[PDB]
Every structure is written in C-alpha cells, then in structure tokens.
C-alpha cells in the first residue's frame, strides 16, 4: 500500500509539472525510517536463518533413532 | 537478492547527475551559455505479483532559459538579446542553430562569424565590406562605415534575423546549438520568421546562468544519497552471504 | 557566476567614464572656443520572473 | 532534505534581494530613475497533524519563502541644473510618450532631448517624442514654459512663434507599469488606461526648462539593507551546514 501521509510540495513555477499555484509534489519518504527498517529486516532475517539451521540439524539427527 | 541492483542503479544515476552538475559548473564563464537541468525519474517494473521494485533513471528535461547578467565591454559589435531573443546562425550541416552568444567576429573578407559559424541575417550569410567599422542598431540593423571616409558616409549594409522561442519547445544539440522540437517545428514551420518585437543593444555581452547555491545543494544531496545506497548494498550483501549458509547440510 | 558582481562592475565603469569626462572638461579650461561636455547614462535590460 | 530545500529557497530569496540592492546602487546618477524594493512572502503550510491547561499539541510545517513583487517608490526626485535649453523636468506626476521603432508606444520620465537632422524633437537614443515637436532652422532661442507650449524665436520677430505643445500622460496606478530597459515603461494590464493631458490640468505636472530630475536612491538605506542581507545569508548557510552534518552522521551510522 502507498503511505497515506500527505506528499510534500515545493515551489517551482518554471516546471511543467507545477499546478496552478506553482507547486510540484515530491514524495514523503523518511530516510531514517527506511534505514531502521533495513536494520530490523536484516536482523530478523539472520534470526530466521539460525532457527532454520538448528531445526534442520535436529531433523537430521532424528533419523538416527 | 535483486534488491542490490536497484540500489546500485540509483548510485550510478547519482554519479551521472553529479557529472552533469560538474559540467554545468565547469563552464561558468562561457558567454551565451544555458545551464543544464537535471531530475530523477521513477521507473517501476510491473511483474506478476507484489510489485515492490521501482528503479530510478537520471534525466535532463532541458536548459533553463533564465537570462544571466551582461558585462559592459563597450565593444562596438557585441550584442545581447532580450528575454527570449535568439541569434540565428548556420551550423556545419546547414541547419539553422539558435544562440545567445553575441560575440561576433569579422574575417579577413568581411564575413561575419560566431565561433566559426557564419551568422545569417535577412537573406543569406551576411558579409559586410572588407575593413569597415560595424555598428549594430537597437533592433538588428547593421551599419558600416569605411575607415577614413567622412562620418556622413555610414550606410546600412544588412539586418540580423532574430527569432523568439518560448523556451519549453527548444532542445539542445550535440554541437551546442538549440533547435526546435518536432512538434513545435511542425506547428511553427521548418524555419522561424524574423519577428520585429525583439530589441537588442550593443556594447554588452551576456554571460552564463548557473546558480552556485543550486550546484552546492545538488552536490551535497548526491553525496548523501550515494552514501545511503552504498550502505544498502553492504547490508544486502551481508544478508545474502550469511543466508547462503542455510544451503549447507 | 554571481549576480551582483557584474552589476557593480558596470556601475564602476559608469563612474569611471563620468570622472573621465569631468577631467577632460577641467583640463582644457584655458583653450579658446571650447564647449563643455555632459555624459548621460541609462539602465540596461531587465529580466522578468514568471509567476503562476 | 526538507531543510536543504527550505534553506535553498532562503538563499535564492536573499540573492534576489542583493541583486535589487545592487541594481538600485548602480544607477545612482541616472536621470529620472525610481528605486525599487522587493517584497517576499511565505509558501503553503503543511498540516501534518490536526490539533487541565496544556499546549495545543499541533504540528504545522512551513515550506519556504518566495519573492512576490518589486515595488518602485514613485516619489519626487531632486532637480539639478544642467544649464541646457532643451532639457525639461517633471514637477509632480506624469510621463512623456515616445514611439518605439516597431510601432508600439512606451513612456519615459527623464528629460534630455536633442534635435535630429530634420528638426524634430527626439530623446538621447533616437526615439522620437510622440507629440512630434518640430523646431525649424535659425532658432535663436527655444522656450518651454510651465505649460506644454513650446515657442521659438526668430531673427527680427516681435513675438515668438508657437511650434506645438508637449502634453504628457498620466496613469491610474503607476506602480504597475512594466519597466523595459533604457529608461522606458510600457503600459500593462496592471496599470490603468493612460490618459494624456496638458501640463497643470487633471492632476498632471509642470515642465521646468533647464533642469533634470535625479534618481531618489537612499544610499544609507541601501547600505543598511546590504549589511542585513549579507548577515542573513551567513545565518542561512548554517542551516545547510547543520543539515549536512546530520545527514553525514546518519549515513555513517
């Protein structure tokens, strides 16, 4: 989904994208938000990798009954 | 894994935009120069499900037509156009280029030129007398006075051809001469008509129009975006490298 | 490029030519049948900023 | 990046202000010139979040500053004597009318007239004065009274002969006139339809012969404004510097 937060707008009359008031719309992205999202996603990725590795080891050792 | 490619593409396009800005800054003193704008365009890819990739490609809409200042050099045959004036010159392949560089030179045989390109006025490439002093009127009339002759022998010898272009319908060419776009060319004819509403003045020469503040802000933003993209590349590589260990047994 | 440098340079040139004609008028105060000179100035072109 | 954009807008506004200050300072000795002052305004405001006794707790982010207009102070300048006989000065309101080469009509204010080879009255630059006053040969003396009548004397003539009248135009709102280069103004939609009148009638001015109107530029005001512009520019650069520091630290960590 696209973020419902209102997009930013800057003043630039010499641009064909500008509306009747000379305002051109720019995306609303939180750089810090994206950075911490990448950090958290990477850490959760690592945790899931470790879980999968441990479960695979236990499954492998189960067959030695 | 493919999330590395969008980030590296963003970094490469940032480098290209930095190159464009550096090129704009390099020629900060060439007379009759038009700066190069730059912008980033999003190019999403429409796959089958969960469209989560939107690349970016740098683009340059065109030159901004804000006129720069003009230095008063008092040279008799230096012209400066109006807000949207355009001196029409003949390029190397016969096409009619438009410039704002008013620095006009005279060859040995009385042939006018601008950076080696013969300027064309009313008729063909205008040629003044051999070694006469030249004066430009306030609307493009060229007067010649043979040196040594009495001052009451000054005679008109030709007239410049000045065209008016809005600015949003002209594109730069490889040599550096603006030409009309396809649609504007179709609408206004192959060759423009010398409108009489443009007035010029002699003795001044127009410089370039590059904004140092815009250049500095663009450079700072480019550097920061490049650093962020590099961090993303590092994170993705580390995650993939540690994830490949899962494939072992 | 900078906005005000090439304006102040033109102002300096105008004042220099004014001083030049003043000095020329003062130099030949003892010559016979001479007429004083006055220079007249004017502003240059103006750039219009387009608004919405 | 929002801080960068806002500070860029502020720097551009200060650049334009310095530009108009330098323009006012440059032509301090130009006849019939009026000073200009630039007025700025704010952009739209973003409403990020809508709003016993506490603070209202509402967010409203600004956008930046843009220049709106440059108003010309159409005041009355001083009169300096040039001792010439074909120079006139305006006392009050009113503009002369001259004809551009293409055919349109533009208005001027300063008076410094020469006579072309034919005899007509033209300004310094070749543009012909619209009322087209013609002064024939053997003109012993030319007189331009407080009214528009121009009278030339001749050899052995008891009374001078009138050779025309210099009517001048008036505008409903002169601040809206478009100022093209070379001390000329052209009518626009902002200013009302001009009406011409003889001097001294319908609020028009009076003509003084032998004087020119100097520009009304206040050097002390311009210097103070220039100092303030420089200091504001130095203040605004700090915003860019601090935003750069923040972004660099964020990228590093």
**Among A5, A10, A31, beta carbon nearest to D63:** A10
**Which residue is it, tokens 């945790």?**
A47
Identify whether the C-beta of residue D202 lies closer than 8 Å to the C-beta of residue D170. Answer: yes
Minimum CA–CA partner of A16 in chain C: C52
Q: Please provide residue B125's backbone torsions phi and psi, each rounded to the nearest 5 degrees.
A: -60, 115
Torsion of CA D71, D74, D75, D77, to 10 degrees: 120
Q: Which of B102, B118, B83 shows the shortest CA–CA distance to D181? A: B83
| DSSP bridge partners of B204 | B72
Identify whether the C-beta of residue B215 lies closer than 8 Å to the C-beta of residue A22. Answer: no
Token representation of residue D58: 């509402």
Supply the DSSP string of B141-207, one letter for each residue.
EEEEE-TTS-GGG-EEEEEB-EEE--SSSEE--SSS-BEE-HHHHHHH-SS----TT---EESEEE-
Q: For chain A, what is the largest distance between any 2 Cα atoms, rounded to a whole number of angstroms?
A: 77
CB contact under 8 A, C45 and B209: no
Task: Collapse the DSSP code of B128 into the 3-class scheme (helix H, G, I; strand E, B; otherwise coil) and give the result.
Answer: coil
Which residues of chain A have a CB within 8 Å of the CB of B214?
A: none
Q: Please provide residue C27's backbone torsions phi and psi, each rounded to the nearest 5 degrees.
A: -65, -45
Supply the DSSP string of chain D, one letter for each residue.
-HHHHHHHHHHHHHHHHHHHHHHHHHTTT-TT-B-EEEEEEE---EEEE---------EEE---EEEEEEEE------EEE---SS-EEEESS-BEEEE-SSS-EEEE----EEE-SSSBEEETTSPEETT--B--SS---EEE-SSSEEEE--TT-SSPEEEEE--EEE-S-GGG-B--TTT-BB--SSS---EEE-TTSTT--EEEETEEEPPB--HHHHHHHHHHHHHHHHHHHHHHHHHHHHHHHHHH-
Shortest Cα–Cα distance, A53 to chain B (Å): 6
Q: Strand pairing of B105-106 and B96-99? A: unpaired
Neighbours of chain B (3+ CB pairs under 8 A): A, C, D
Evaluate the CA torsion angle D43, D44, D46, D51 in order and state its sign. Answer: positive
The span from the CA of B120 to the CA of B135, in Å, is 17
Method by which the model was determined = cryo-EM
Shortest Cα–Cα distance, D179 to chain C (Å): 8
DSSP state of B84: T
Q: Chain A interface residues facing chain D, Cβ-Cβ under 8 Å? A: 5-6, 8-11, 21, 23, 31-32, 35
Identify whether the C-beta of residue B106 lies closer than 8 Å to the C-beta of residue B112. Answer: yes
Q: Which of D2, D1, D14 shows the shortest CA–CA distance to D65? A: D14
Minimum CA–CA partner of C44 in chain D: D181
- C-alpha B198: how far from chain center: 21
The span from the CA of D86 to the CA of D124, in Å, is 11
| DSSP bridge partners of B39 | B59
Token representation of residue B137: 């009127």
What residues contact D118, with CB distance under 8 A and at least 6 apart?
D134
**Which residue is it, tokens 């010499």?**
A14
The span from the CA of D62 to the CA of A20, in Å, is 20
The span from the CA of B149 to the CA of B143, in Å, is 14
Determine which helix (DSSP H) or strand (DSSP E) holds A10, and give its type and residue range.
strand A8-11
Residue of C40, C45, C47 for testing the chain D interface, max D β-carbons within 10 Å: C40
Shortest Cα–Cα distance, D227 to chain A (Å): 27
Determine which helix (DSSP H) or strand (DSSP E) holds B112, and give its type and residue range.
strand B112-113
Residue C15 to residues D25, D26, D27, D30, D197, Cα–Cα distance (Å): 12, 9, 10, 11, 37
Q: Which of D18, D11, D17, D9 shows the shortest CA–CA distance to D42? A: D9
The span from the CA of D2 to the CA of D13, in Å, is 17
Task: Collapse the DSSP code of B24 into the 3-class scheme (helix H, G, I; strand E, B; otherwise coil) and give the result.
Answer: helix
Q: Judge residue C13's burial from the number of C-beta atoms within 10 Å of its C-beta, 0-12 exposed, 13-18 middle, 19 or more buried.
A: middle
Our CA angle for B67, B73, B79, nearest 5°, is 50
Which residues of chain D have a CB within 8 Å of the CB of A6?
A: 46-48
- C-alpha C43: how far from chain center: 10
Task: Collapse the DSSP code of B80 into the 3-class scheme (helix H, G, I; strand E, B; otherwise coil) and give the result.
Answer: strand
Shortest Cα–Cα distance, A1 to chain B (Å): 10
DSSP state of B136: E
Our CA angle for D232, D234, D235, nearest 5°, is 65
Is B139 an interface residue toward D (CB < 8 Å)?
yes
In the stretch 26-65 of chain B, residues with CB closer than 8 A to chain A read 64
Which residues of chain C have a CB within 8 Å of the CB of D30?
A: 41-43
Which residues of chain A have a CB within 8 Å of the CB of D42?
A: none
Identify whether the C-beta of residue B95 lies closer than 8 Å to the C-beta of residue B179. Answer: yes
Token representation of residue B51: 């469209």
In the stretch 63-82 of chain B, residues with CB closer than 8 A to chain C read 66-72, 74, 80, 82
Q: What is the resolution of this structure in A?
A: 3.3
CB contact under 8 A, B220 and D4: yes
Q: Strand pairing of A8-11 and A23-26? A: antiparallel
**Among B64, B231, B242, beta carbon nearest to A14:** B64
Q: Strand pairing of A23-26 and D113-115? A: unpaired
- Count CB atoms within 10 A of the CB of residue B99: 22
Which residues of chain D have a CB within 8 Å of the CB of C7?
A: 19, 22-23, 26
CB contact under 8 A, B245 and A53: yes
Is B168 an interface residue toward A (CB < 8 Å)?
yes
CB contact under 8 A, B68 and C1: yes
Burial B210-222 (b: 16+ CB within 10 A, else e): bbebbbbbbebbb
The span from the CA of D46 to the CA of A10, in Å, is 11
The span from the CA of A32 to the CA of C16, in Å, is 57
Reduce the secondary structure of B36-53 to three states and give it as a string. Answer: ECCEEEEEECCCCCCCCC
CB contact under 8 A, A14 and B228: no
DSSP state of B244: G
Token representation of residue A1: 């989904």
Identify whether the C-beta of residue D93 lies closer than 8 Å to the C-beta of residue D197. Answer: no
| DSSP bridge partners of D40 | D67
Is C52 an interface residue toward A (CB < 8 Å)?
yes
Identify whether the C-beta of residue B165 lies closer than 8 Å to the C-beta of residue B180. Answer: yes
Burial B72-89 (b: 16+ CB within 10 A, else e): beeeebbbbbbbbbbbbb
Burial B155-188 (b: 16+ CB within 10 A, else e): eebbbbbbbbbebebbeeeeeebbbbeeebeeee
Our CA angle for B55, B57, B62, nearest 5°, is 150
Token representation of residue D220: 């002390």
The span from the CA of B178 to the CA of B181, in Å, is 9
| DSSP bridge partners of D63 | none
Identify whether the C-beta of residue B64 lies closer than 8 Å to the C-beta of residue B82. Answer: no
Residue A31 to residues A36, B48, B157, D157, D250, Cα–Cα distance (Å): 9, 28, 64, 90, 9
- Left, alpha or beta for B92 (phi > 0: left; psi -120 to 50: alpha)? alpha
Residue B244 to residues A45, A49, B52, B248, Cα–Cα distance (Å): 12, 9, 23, 8
What residues contact B188, with CB distance under 8 A and at least 6 apart?
B180
Q: Strand pairing of B105-106 and D96-99? A: unpaired
């Amino acid at each position: 989904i696209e973020s419902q937060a209102p997009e930013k707008l800057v003043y630039e009359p010499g641009n064909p994208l500008a509306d009747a008031n000379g305002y051109v719309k720019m995306p609303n992205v939180d750089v810090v938000g994206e950075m911490v999202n990448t950090m958290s996603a990477s850490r959760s990725y690592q945790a899931n990798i470790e879980v999968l590795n441990t479960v695979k080891s236990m499954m492998l050792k189960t067959l030695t009954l | 894994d493919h999330a590395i490619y969008t980030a590296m593409g963003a970094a490469s396009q940032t480098l290209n935009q930095q190159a464009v800005t550096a090129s704009n800054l390099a020629n900060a003193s060439t007379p009759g120069f038009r700066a190069q704008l730059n912008a980033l365009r999003a190019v999403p890819v429409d796959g089958l499900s969960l469209a989560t990739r939107t690349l970016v490609t740098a683009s340059t809409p065109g030159a901004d037509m804000t006129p720069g200042q003009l230095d008063y050099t008092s040279r008799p045959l230096d012209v400066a156009l109006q807000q949207d004036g355009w001196l029409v010159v003949q390029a190397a392949d016969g096409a009619e280029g438009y410039t704002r560089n008013g620095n006009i030179q005279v060859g040995p045989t009385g042939q006018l030129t601008i950076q080696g390109h013969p300027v064309i006025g009313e008729g063909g490439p205008i040629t003044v007398p051999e070694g006469s002093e030249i004066t430009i009127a306030a609307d493009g009339t060229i007067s010649a006075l043979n040196p040594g002759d009495p001052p009451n022998t000054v005679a008109p010898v030709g007239r410049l051809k000045l065209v008016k272009a809005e600015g949003n319908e002209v594109q730069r060419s490889d040599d550096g001469l603006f030409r009309l776009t396809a649609e504007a060319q179709a609408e206004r004819g192959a060759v423009l008509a010398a409108d009489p509403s443009i007035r010029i003045m002699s003795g001044v020469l127009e410089g370039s129009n590059v904004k140092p503040v815009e250049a500095m802000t663009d450079m700072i933003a480019n550097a920061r975006r490049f650093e962020m993209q590099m961090k993303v590349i590092t994170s993705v590589d580390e995650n993939e490298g540690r994830a490949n260990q899962l494939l072992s047994m | 490029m900078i906005s005000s440098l090439w304006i102040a340079k033109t102002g300096l040139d105008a004042q220099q030519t004014n001083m030049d004609v003043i000095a020329n008028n003062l130099a030949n105060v003892s010559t016979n049948g001479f007429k004083r000179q006055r220079a007249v100035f004017e502003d240059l072109l103006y750039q219009t900023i387009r608004q919405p | 990046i929002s801080s960068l954009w806002i500070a860029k807008t502020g720097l551009d506004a200060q650049q334009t202000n310095m530009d108009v200050i330098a323009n006012n300072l440059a032509n301090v000795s130009t006849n019939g010139f009026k000073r200009q002052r630039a007025v700025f305004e704010d952009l739209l405001y973003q409403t990020i979040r809508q709003p016993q006794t506490t603070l209202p707790s509402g967010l409203q982010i600004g956008t930046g500053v843009r220049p709106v207009a440059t108003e010309r102070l159409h005041s009355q300048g001083n009169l300096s004597q040039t001792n010439n006989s074909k120079d006139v000065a305006i006392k009050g309101q009113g503009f002369f009318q001259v004809m551009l080469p293409d055919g349109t009509s533009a208005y001027t204010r300063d008076g410094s007239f020469q006579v072309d080879q034919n005899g007509q009255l033209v300004t310094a630059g070749g543009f012909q004065v619209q009322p087209a006053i013609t002064i024939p040969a053997n003109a012993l003396s030319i007189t331009i009274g407080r009214d528009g009548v121009v009278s030339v004397t001749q050899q052995g003539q008891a009374a001078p002969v009138q050779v025309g009248q210099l009517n001048l135009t008036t505008f409903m709102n002169d601040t809206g006139l478009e100022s093209i280069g070379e001390n000329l103004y052209i009518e626009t939609q902002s200013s009302g339809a001009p009406n011409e009148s003889t001097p001294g009638l319908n609020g028009a001015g009076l003509l003084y012969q032998g004087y020119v109107e100097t520009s009304n530029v206040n050097v002390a005001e311009e210097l103070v404004n220039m100092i303030q512009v420089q200091r504001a520019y130095e203040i605004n650069s700090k915003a860019v510097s601090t935003t750069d520091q923040m972004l660099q630290k964020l990228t590093q960590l």
